[PDB]
Amino acid sequence: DKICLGHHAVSNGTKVNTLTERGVEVVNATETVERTNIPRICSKGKRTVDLGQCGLLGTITGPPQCDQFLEFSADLIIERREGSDVCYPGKFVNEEALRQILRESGGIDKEAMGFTYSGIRTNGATSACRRSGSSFYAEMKWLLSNTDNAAFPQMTKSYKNTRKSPALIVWGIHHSVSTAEQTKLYGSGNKLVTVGSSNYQQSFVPSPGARPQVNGLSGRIDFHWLMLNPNDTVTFSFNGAFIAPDRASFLRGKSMGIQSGVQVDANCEGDCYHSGGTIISNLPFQNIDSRAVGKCPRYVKQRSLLLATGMKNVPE
């Protein structure tokens, strides 16, 4: 008469690794590295802005593509490959720093800067910024001499930040195709743009010069920016080639921004995104994308690491 002690086993054992052995079979195991991707941006519970053809920096200058977003609010901001910050050719200087500020901004609130003008045209426009015909950046003013060739009066305009938050200020310098074009617009003589705050003075010179047509134009407007602090003033002195801001921007609160090439989906909830979708997982690791952002499992190199959830499998 006899009694034995034993333990269970199965025919479907799974291999795992241990400190001592590769592929020891165990009764049960679970994956620890996430491979499963949802090819959508799971946006449920978040105020989402899909910027589409609008590039994020354009929300500040306002080319036509960005008209809907000049004062956007968002918890989650999605940039797209097709988005351009620009209508008239050019770019932002320090673009990426600025992009990063706007991605976590919560959105932006615009405020008028109060500049007005005498002795000059203010209606500079281009066929590259198309609204109801030729137009320009919604938040800027292309200042020009009162007539072709005529002298551009030396000017000063200042703006003080009344609010309790730093104001994003932006301006542009116009780089003409030829000193001859730069004279038609702003008159002959050397052109200079001085931009002074308390914690910032800098000069900018238009560098006219031939260059490839982009959109059929060889001009460039390049944008510069600075943070003006509460109670600080920014002063602008110039005799031409200046693209003046109409409005300043204040950051709303908190957001996260991503870049992506897949559809939004307001039904699924997610907190970890990457260009190709959303990683929904409690697993501690993932092998989908090293640049995933949000609250994420840690990216690892391996596709799989099985964690034993049962004992060694010793079948007969």
């Binding site: 008469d1 006899k2 009694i3 034995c4 002690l5 034993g6 333990h7 269970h8 086993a9 199965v10 025919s11 690794n17 241990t18 400190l19 001592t20 020891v24 165990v26 679970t30 620890t32 590295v33 940039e79 490959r81 673009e95 990426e96 992009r99 990063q100 976590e104 996260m256 921004g257 991503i258 870049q259 260009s275 409690n282 697993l283 501690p284 690791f285 090293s290 640049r291 952002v293 949000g294 609250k295 994420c296 499992p297 840690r298 990216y299 690892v300 190199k301 391996q302 690491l305 099985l306 964690l307 034993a308 959830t309 049962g310 004992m311 060694k312 499998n313 010793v314 079948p315 007969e316």
Partner: protein, 167 residues
């Protein structure tokens, strides 16, 4: 033809991780031990609760997929990211390797604890056969078998008879 854990596991045991298999005049029977099963499961469940954790730390883009950042800073960023990836990749291989070694040894250790507990219930009335079984040196009916299982077997009742049979 009945054997214990030293030889191998039991495919037929589906109600539990550990069990008892007996042979008497009334035949063969298998039954799961609930306590040692649960002990094991709860320790595994405790591993899972600890390893299925979410970081509460949020990370943001420092990099741009559409418009590549300046090359020097990009190379520093990539180096940093790749270094971190090496660290986590090593941590994750180690975590799983180590936890698996521990899980395996833990389960074996519960088996041993049950075996040792029965050995001590049986006192001088049984002998280890070497395969994870005890040869019991008295008649042990289904009720005496059940009493070994539920920890109520009183070795005094059978001692006289068993010690006599061991010679």
């Amino acid at each position: 033809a009945i054997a214990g854990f030293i030889e191998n596991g039991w495919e037929g045991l589906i109600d539990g991780w550990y069990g008892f298999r007996h042979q008497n005049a009334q035949g063969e029977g298998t039954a799961a031990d609930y306590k040692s099963t649960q002990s094991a499961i709860d320790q595994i469940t405790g591993k899972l609760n600890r390893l299925i954790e979410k970081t509460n730390q949020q990370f943001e883009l420092i990099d741009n997929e559409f418009n590549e950042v300046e090359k020097q800073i990009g190379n520093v960023i990539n180096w940093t990211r790749d270094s971190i990836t090496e660290v986590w990749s090593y941590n994750a291989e180690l975590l799983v390797a180590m936890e698996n070694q521990h899980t395996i040894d833990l389960a074996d250790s519960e088996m041993d604890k049950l075996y040792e507990r029965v050995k001590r219930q049986l006192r001088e009335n049984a002998e280890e056969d070497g395969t994870g079984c005890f040869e019991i040196f008295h008649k042990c009916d289904d009720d005496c078998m059940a009493s070994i299982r539920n920890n109520t077997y009183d070795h005094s009742k059978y001692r006289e008879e068993a010690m006599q049979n061991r010679i």
